């Protein structure tokens, strides 16, 4: 077939893509920045093709629901074709593996806490040891998964309390959870990767931190439909860039080269 | 094709596989002990597959050579058809991914210096600013391929030096390296896995340490041919090992329960 345009999903999620501040007078992919924003143009150029950016309609990461086994998300855009290829921070997964592909990660991650700075807790047993102080995980994502099927005793101690707690310790987006944190006087805890959850101690008004060690090790990769002609190149490609230095660049440059908590 | 024994290849590498403390009174499989081996049965389990483990002819983890593009090691086991699949730290590369699969990472890491206690380096830059203090990599593997590749300043002025040291700074296994550091009075750094690092701090006599942040980030990955009937459902199976804590499990075992340095 003759080169078409790529449609790539992926996710308002900070800093990984962002609305450019003059964004109101651009057009196409030069109305977005970030991480994967980078990271696109990078895979497209070593892999030949030309590319559009979308962002997920239902701004989810993806989810399939137990009854309907219908997948949301961007997980959903690539099972349904409505996206060619999803560039974002979305984690590699068994369900998802089962009907998609990814390429080797692009980045390294584990679960980890966000603590509003002074809150008595450094641990997800201590969470999970009391409850007074709340907390919950982003919806129809790989953290809320990860709770949900784990059989680690600290682990499903805490699923049995989010699922049940009212009102909803859930929340729609990151952006949501760290509003929660922030506002909440050290009585809301939020379970998030580590990647976002470092992102965010290093923006104003610097009144959150990382607490205790990932509960995981696990990755990010570029994901593609089964059958796609793109799978193999795109793979190659992120190898490639993460041995040429230029992942890890694009990290520093986007969480800690404009860190706004100072050296 | 009815069902037949997997010939899995393996090295003697610390502690993924080592000989058992009465292997000579012992057959087969029950030879060996350590955390490659416990992986090798749960994922062997998962894929409902007999195997045998062997170790590698050569003893090497697997490079090509730029003339002849003969490979070795491990990975010319799987390219020349000695062995069904590597169960092994064998790190996943661009230049091994173009010849042969790997599943999703089992473990991450990155390349990291040991040093003799004492030695007064705290960084790659700090080697690559000095004379005095020899340092170098395992042959054959995708540490001495990360630095010749590498066109960062810092790495390719170690590369610089370590291709054309005299006397040769590279070493034929990991034993060998670790025993130069312990025997070279500080004069011999060593450039190896994170993994690797930190399973010798924690074994006596305890005079080594890693210093400094990783060089990389990286994966282990389970290994096989092109073609090969295995590889989804081996990449399934590390997947659903991750994810239910086992993989975790296994490196405390092996790196930390037993450790000999205190605790
Ligand atoms: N990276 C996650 C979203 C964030 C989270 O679940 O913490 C995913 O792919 O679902
Ligand atoms: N894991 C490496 C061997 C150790 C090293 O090179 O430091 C490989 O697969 O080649």
Chains 1, 2 share one sequence.
């Not at 629901?65 to 984690?91: Q, S």
């Not at 590699?92 to 509003?116: A, N, Q």
Request: charged residues 25%; glycine residues 10%; contains cysteine.
């Amino acid at each position: 077939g003759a080169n078409k345009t790529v449609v790539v999903t992926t996710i308002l999620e900070s800093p990984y893509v962002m609305m450019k501040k003059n964004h109101e007078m651009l057009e196409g992919n030069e109305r977005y920045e970030g991480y994967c924003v980078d990271l696109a143009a990078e895979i497209a150029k070593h892999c030949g093709f030309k590319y559009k950016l979308t962002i997920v309609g239902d701004g989810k990461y993806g989810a399939r629901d137990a009854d309907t086994k219908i997948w949301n998300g961007m997980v959903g855009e690539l099972v349904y074709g409505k996206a060619d290829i999803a560039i974002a921070p979305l984690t590699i997964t068994l369900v998802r593996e089962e009907v998609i592909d990814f390429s080797k990660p692009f980045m390294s991650l584990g679960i980890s806490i966000m603590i509003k700075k002074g809150t008595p807790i450094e641990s997800a047993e201590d969470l999970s040891k009391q409850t007074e102080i709340a907390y919950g995980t982003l919806d129809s994502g790989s953290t809320k998964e990860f709770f949900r099927r784990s059989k680690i005793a600290v682990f499903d101690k805490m699923w049995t309390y989010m699922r049940s707690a009212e009102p909803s310790v859930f929340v729609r987006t990151t952006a949501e959870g760290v509003a929660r944190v922030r506002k909440s006087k050290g009585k809301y805890a939020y379970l998030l990767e580590s990647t976002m959850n470092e992102y965010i101690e290093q923006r104003k008004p610097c009144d959150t931190m990382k607490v205790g060690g990932n509960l995981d090790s696990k990755g990010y990769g570029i994901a593609t439909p089964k059958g796609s002609s793109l799978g193999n190149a795109v793979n190659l490609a992120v190898l490639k860039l993460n041995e040429q230095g230029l992942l890890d660049k694009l990290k520093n440059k986007w969480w800690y080269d404009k860190g706004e908590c100072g050296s």
